[PDB]
Subunit: 105 residues, 2 copies
């Protein structure tokens, strides 16, 4: 299932506890049409791939995290392995999302 | 100078009162780095071109306007003439912003 992040402390701790697993973060906004469109698919991925950690961050709720990760489009998916960003793209493209996960896992 | 929009009613009325003038709308978010970076230049344009109307809309303040204009990146500049959208692009590119205004005015 998807973990809801509500502070910078929580964001950093999740990246830590992740260990060697791939982490996928969905940066979204409640008023953005695509974001709402791709939400159910994002949750399905977390049930299919149990060896990957899925996190959700509302940019309005955590303005400090959004600003530091340099987010500028919604939704933006950022990929991390061992505390480091190893991938990134924006837009609600289902095929590309899953294809990227298979490349980095 | 730049007009701050704080409701959908105000947005529609400005587009109306505009008459035959070109309208440039800056869709932004307070936490987005580029947005803050290009703000002073956007205001300078409103003092240079007095025959063009410049409007600013915070996407968090007017979620209904952002959603209907289908905004997905920040900042997004949308151009309107006689109630119709005649141009659009996103990103803080100063040259492109001014060059577009000279093409549509």
């Amino acid at each position: 299932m998807v973990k809801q992040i509500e502070s910078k402390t929580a964001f950093q701790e999740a990246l830590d506890a992740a260990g060697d697993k791939l982490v996928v973060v969905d940066f979204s906004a409640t008023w953005c049409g695509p974001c709402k469109m791709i939400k159910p698919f994002f949750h399905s991925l977390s049930e299919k791939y149990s060896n990957v950690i899925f996190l959700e961050v509302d940019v309005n709720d955590c303005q400090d995290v959004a600003s530091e990760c340099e987010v500028k489009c919604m939704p933006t998916f950022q990929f991390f392995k061992k505390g480091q960003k190893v991938g990134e793209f924006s837009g609600a493209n289902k095929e590309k999302l899953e294809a990227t996960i298979n490349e980095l896992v």
